[PDB]
Amino acid sequence: LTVDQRRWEDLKSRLKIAQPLHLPPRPDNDGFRAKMYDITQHPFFKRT
Numbered sequence: 001l002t003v004d005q006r007r008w009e010d011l012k013s014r015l016k017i018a019q020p021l022h023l024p025p026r027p028d029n030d031g032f033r034a035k036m037y038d039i040t041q042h043p044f045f046k047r048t
Helices: 005-015 031-037 043-047
Strands: none
Touching: none
């Protein structure tokens, strides 16, 4: 086989294993939960 078909087989074997994310959505029980879940998805504090 050529290199593009080898790359396609690599794409097949990569999507063979991988699974989607299971991250929970935004909880609206109080303002503290929302304002902590808003701030922790910031690329500055993650860099800190």
